[PDB]
């Protein structure tokens, strides 16, 4: 019943099965986009995705073995990085555009409807372009998203005794299993050992850019919140506030 006894194939199957439902943006919005209407659509979508993210995280091998306090910390840390990697993945087949949902495809100029948004859209578009150049596969994407969940908040727990040490060790062992899984997928695809290590490094280095985008996205959302332009649900509010606490 342990995440640490899974084969690379069982890990991929568990991650694919964990996938949240596909959501559509709120039906028939008025034309054109105002700063308030664009922010409202994007945050309503983000809050609905966050509800399903909780269920997804509970299905990620090793997550439910952690304490409730630690599960809360990992999610509060990683939420926006996870929303962004999902967005970047969905947008790979739409050059120059972001597929927020199947009925919500935005171009960079539509990003200009919200102050400070176009700069974030550009970083997201660049990540989507990078994933396309790398020909990122679905099985690799699910490994990366689970790496974000487990890694993002792992260096920022308190020192909650020896239990905190046990928890961090557990997370690092699950992350090691995910590395083994990515390597297996690359080996099965016919990549040489040198190409396998090179590709693993390239994928993991992109996670540093996703972290940067999440920090910028966080500052932007807080600024939109403060200006009284967007109403927010408590789940999204709690996730955002964890980065101000």
């Amino acid at each position: 019943s342990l995440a640490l006894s899974l084969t690379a194939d069982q890990m991929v199957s568990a991650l694919l099965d964990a996938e949240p439902p596909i959501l559509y943006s709120e039906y028939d919005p008025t034309r054109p986009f105002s700063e308030a209407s664009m922010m409202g659509l994007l945050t309503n979508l983000a809050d609905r995705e966050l509800v399903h993210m909780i269920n997804w995280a509970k299905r990620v091998p090793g997550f439910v073995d952690l304490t409730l306090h630690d599960q809360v910390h990992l999610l509060e840390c990683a939420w926006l990085e996870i929303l962004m990697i999902g967005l970047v993945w969905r947008s790979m087949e739409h050059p120059g555009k972001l597929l927020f949902a199947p009925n919500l495809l935005l171009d960079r100029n539509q990003g200009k409807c919200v102050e400070g948004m176009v700069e974030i859209f550009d970083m997201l578009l660049a990540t989507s372009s990078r994933f396309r150049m790398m020909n990122l596969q679905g099985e690799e994407f699910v490994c990366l998203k689970s790496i974000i969940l487990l890694n993002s908040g792992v260096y920022t727990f308190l020192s909650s005794t020896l239990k905190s040490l046990e928890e961090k060790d557990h997370i690092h062992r699950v992350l090691d299993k995910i590395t083994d899984t990515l390597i297996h997928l690359m080996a099965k695809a016919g990549l040489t050992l040198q190409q396998q290590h090179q590709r693993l490094a390239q994928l993991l280095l992109i996670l540093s850019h996703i972290r940067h985008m999440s920090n910028k996205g966080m500052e932007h959302l807080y600024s939109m919140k403060c200006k009284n332009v967007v109403p927010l649900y408590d789940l999204l509010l709690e996730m955002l506030d964890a980065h101000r606490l």
Binding site: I54, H69, Q71, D234, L235, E238
Partner: peptide, 11 residues
């Protein structure tokens, strides 16, 4: 921190 902590505990 209640909402997230409560939503994680159920099933």
């Amino acid at each position: 921190h209640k909402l997230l902590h409560q939503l994680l505990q159920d099933s």
